[PDB]
Amino acid sequence: PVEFPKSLRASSHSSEGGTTKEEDIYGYELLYRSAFASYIAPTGAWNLVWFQAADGSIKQARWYGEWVISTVLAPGKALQGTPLTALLWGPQDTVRLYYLSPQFELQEWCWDTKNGADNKYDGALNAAKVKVAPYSKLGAVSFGGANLRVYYQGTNNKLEEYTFGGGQGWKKGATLPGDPLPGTYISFVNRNKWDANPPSIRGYFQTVTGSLAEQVWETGGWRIGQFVIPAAPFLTPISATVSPEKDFPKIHVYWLSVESTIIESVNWHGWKAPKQIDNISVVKADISATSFTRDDGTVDVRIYGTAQLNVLFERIFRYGVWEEKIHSISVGKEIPIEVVGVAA
Amino acid sequence: PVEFPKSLRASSHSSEGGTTKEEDIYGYELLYRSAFASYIAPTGAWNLVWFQAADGSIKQARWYGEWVISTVLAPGKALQGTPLTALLWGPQDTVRLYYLSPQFELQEWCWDTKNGADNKYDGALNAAKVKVAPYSKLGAVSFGGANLRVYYQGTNNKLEEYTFGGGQGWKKGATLPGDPLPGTYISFVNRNKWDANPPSIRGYFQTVTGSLAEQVWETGGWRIGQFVIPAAPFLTPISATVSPEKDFPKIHVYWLSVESTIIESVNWHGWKAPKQIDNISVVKADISATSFTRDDGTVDVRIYGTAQLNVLFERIFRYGVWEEKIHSISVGKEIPIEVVGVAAAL
Ligand SMILES: CO[C@@H]1O[C@@H](C)[C@@H](O)[C@@H](O)[C@@H]1O
Ligand SMILES: CO[C@@H]1O[C@@H](C)[C@@H](O)[C@@H](O)[C@@H]1O
Ligand SMILES: CO[C@@H]1O[C@@H](C)[C@@H](O)[C@@H](O)[C@@H]1O
Ligand SMILES: CO[C@@H]1O[C@@H](C)[C@@H](O)[C@@H](O)[C@@H]1O
Ligand SMILES: CO[C@@H]1O[C@@H](C)[C@@H](O)[C@@H](O)[C@@H]1O
Ligand SMILES: CO[C@@H]1O[C@@H](C)[C@@H](O)[C@@H](O)[C@@H]1O
Structure with a gap:
């Protein structure tokens, strides 16, 4: 078997006190610790996820x-x-996917479906040849x-x-502002x-001190925001999503704890105390929320990422609860492996 | 500060029971979780280490x-x-470094220094255009x-x-044999x-069951060896090295525990029980031993890899002991970050 820290839960079917002995899946055609991007249709009618395959191609999972x-x-x-x-x-007929070339330049893939097109x-971003730090991550918004x-x-x-x-x-x-890690x-x-x-823009990132911080844009310019988490794991994955709840924007900010469990901080008429959404340890690697x-004005959330051992997970917040059944999306060949919890 | 598991030690200046509050280094021009290769001269006169920088270039650290x-x-x-x-x-004038191209083909870098050369x-391996599994690791030996x-x-x-x-x-x-993870x-x-x-070849790898296993070549062909670790962390780094001790080859095999501490098994007139060489948690990422x-007949060992937060470490086994001073080799710009040990998620 493979060894796993006894005090952590590797899956929804792990024992309540941690991992004892169980079977988990290795999807080896998903790049280990793949990045993820995602967007759920504003109607909820379909879902899009993008990820990197082991062979380096960028693939798409579409639920319809x-x-x-x-x-x-x-x-x-x-x-x-x-x-x-x-x-x-468009509201939902125009897709852009941003990534880095092997020379660390910003790149853009375009998918247009307006008026029945499929282009x-x-x-055009590719032609600006924008060189970034080689370990740079990416965020983006659209408006108007x-x-x-x-x-x-x-x-x-x-941050630029x-x-x-x-x-x-493109200009x-x-x-x-701020001092990003x-x-x-x-x-x-x-x-x-x-x-x-x-627009009304918020960005979330980790500073050189290890704290988590917030960028704010409103008319008047960029400012460091009130969202402050004093300490977080080194290079913790971060993903945020916003949608109106009862006609007011509800920001959900997700990051990983020291146990690699997902922490959620909600802003909706003020920030709420951070909370662990479940106690299952994911692979410390990129997550993507949408x-x-x-x-009726309630907000659904989906989070995609890597679960043990290398599985594309989908966590679902629907009708006001995180569903205990965590979905998995197969993206290729897989092998099951026994996992045993080991103490120090 | 950055949060670190309270029960683990991030460095040799961590407190005895784990991490409380300390300062650690982030060398951000080292690729995070870089691969490592290494070779110490058979005379011990100089050391070579290779690694990947954040910009994707392959760099060399040379101690002389x-x-x-x-x-x-x-x-x-x-x-x-x-x-x-x-x-x-050569015994020590001809170096080869193997790596993968961005198209997942075997590549070879050559450094020849015999008879005063610096080439x-x-x-020639590059022209063979050998495509490998995109997540393939690499090993190599030379003989005759x-x-x-x-x-x-x-x-x-x-494994091929x-x-x-x-x-x-190149052919x-x-x-x-076996079923590699x-x-x-x-x-x-x-x-x-x-x-x-x-030659007398040994290879160490992880199987589809999670166990660690051993490839053996002797005259007659390949077979699965008697080295068996029944359980190890998923995709644990593995590195082995061998050198003669008292006219007998002494194999050291290193991998990581679930705490990301380095475990050592020695083969020298039989396999000895696996043992943790120190209780400091490295980054779960490639290590390289030489x-x-x-x-006088005794075998020195060097191990290179990534320590918290992202620094190139050198661990030294010299005159029969692991030295308590774990070195760091600077490879570029660095920032110090405060680390606090944390017990629960919130
Ligand atoms: C029409 O141009 C295409 O659509 C625009 C919204 C931009 O995404 C641009 O880079 C792209 O080439
Ligand atoms: C009007 O200002 C422009 O649009 C805003 C929404 C911001 O992206 C700002 O940095 C940019 O200069
Ligand atoms: C007015 O406050 C600003 O806008 C809120 C919606 C939050 O993003 C807060 O952290 C930020 O400082
Ligand atoms: C002279 O040839 C060089 O040295 C040999 C030992 C091989 O490494 C070969 O691939 C290389 O091109
Ligand atoms: C003589 O056989 C050749 O040399 C041995 C040392 C092994 O590398 C073997 O796989 C190869 O076919
Ligand atoms: C003869 O046995 C083989 O050679 C020894 C040196 C060890 O590598 C052992 O595990 C292997 O099975």
Whole structure:
């Protein structure tokens, strides 16, 4: 068997006090510690997830009655271990996926379906040849339709912005305040509606002290926000999502604890105390959260990431509860392995 | 501060029962979880270590009175996150470094220094365009001078061999027995002297059950060896090295515990019980061990890898003891970060 810390739970079927003996799955055609991007349709009618396969291609999992896997970027287009982040607007007929080339330049994949089209192509961002820090992660928001903002870590480790819209093409945007940890995960959201202008932007990242911090944009410029977590694991994965709950934006910020369990902090008329959403230890690796608002004004959340041993998980917050059944999305060949809990 | 499990020790200055509050170093120009290759000179006169920088280049650290850092492969030569393994013979004037291209093909870097040379160049292996499983690790041994064997994981997850020597060029070699874990770390050693023929080859890897296992080559062919660890962490780093102790090959095999502490098994007139060499938790990431025999008959060991938070460590076994001073080799810009030991999630 493989050995696992006895005090941690590897799966939903692990014993209540930790792992004793169980079977878990190794999906070896998923890149170990793959990045993830995702977007659930604002209607909730379908789901999109993107990930990196072991062969380096970027693939897509789409749920529409059932999960279907496809390849969107051939092997060689993306850095091995590229970050990923996605945009969806129109309200839901135009998709952009951002990633890094093997030369650490920002890249954009475009999928247009407006008016029955089905066009997939390399976006104009590629031609700006924007070199980033080689360990940079990626965030992005959209507003007013096709006004786009891409967030990255520059070669001097500051967080940087690239902008698109209003006929200007891609141009360098703001240099953000704060002192980001080199290689920090980053996640940016827009609290205002996809077709609204101006946006209301929040980004989440880890500072050089290890704390978690917040970027704020409102009319008037960029500011460091009130969201402060004094200590977090080194290079903890971070992902945030926002959707209106009872007509007010509900920000969900997720990161990993020292036990590699998912911690959630909610902003909705103020910040709520952080809370562990479940006590199952995921693989310390990228997570991706997305959300939508139902007809009665409640907000659903999905989180994608890597579970033991190398499985694409989907955690579901629906009708006000985290579902104890954690879904898995098969992306290729798999082998089952016995896992035994071992103490120090 | 950054949070670290309270029951683990992040460095040698951590408190005795685990981490309380301390300062640690993040070297951010070292690729996080870099691969490592290494070789100490058989005379012990100098050390070589290879690693991947954050920008994807492959760099070398060379100790000869002091550490000197150089770049040996420019950005774009290697897969980001490439495995690394090195050979040294002549007894110590010919170096080869194996890595993967961004297209998952075996690549070879050559450094020849015999007779005053300083020649660095791409090897003939590159032109063979050998495609490997994209998560393949790499091992290698040499014998009879320039007879070379490179070990990798094929697309069907079996361990495979490529051969060089005897005027034949690079050719496909054996398919090895056993059922290797996809993406297993692998480490191969030659128990016989560099100029001797036949060799005596041992390889260490992790199986689909999670156990650790051993490949054996002697005259007659390959077989599965008697070294068995029934359970180990998923995709645990593995590194082995061998050097003669009292005219008998002494194999050291290293892997990580669930606490990410380094475990050692020795083979020297039989396998000894596995034992933790120290209780400091390294980053769960590639390690590289090398060894040589002093002219008094005793075997020194060096181990390189990633320590908290991201620094290149050197652990030293010298004159029969693991030295308490665990060195760090700076490879670029660094920032100090405060680390606090934390018991629960919140
Ligand atoms: C029409 O241009 C395409 O769509 C825009 C919204 C941008 O994503 C641009 O980079 C892309 O090439
Ligand atoms: C109006 O200002 C522009 O758009 C805002 C939404 C921000 O992206 C800002 O950095 C940018 O300069
Ligand atoms: C007004 O406060 C700002 O906006 C809120 C929605 C939060 O993002 C808060 O952390 C931030 O400082
Ligand atoms: C002279 O040839 C060089 O040395 C041999 C030992 C091999 O490493 C070969 O691939 C390399 O090109
Ligand atoms: C003589 O046989 C060749 O040399 C041995 C040392 C092994 O490398 C074997 O796989 C190879 O076929
Ligand atoms: C003869 O036995 C073989 O050689 C020994 C040196 C060990 O490597 C052992 O595990 C292996 O089975």
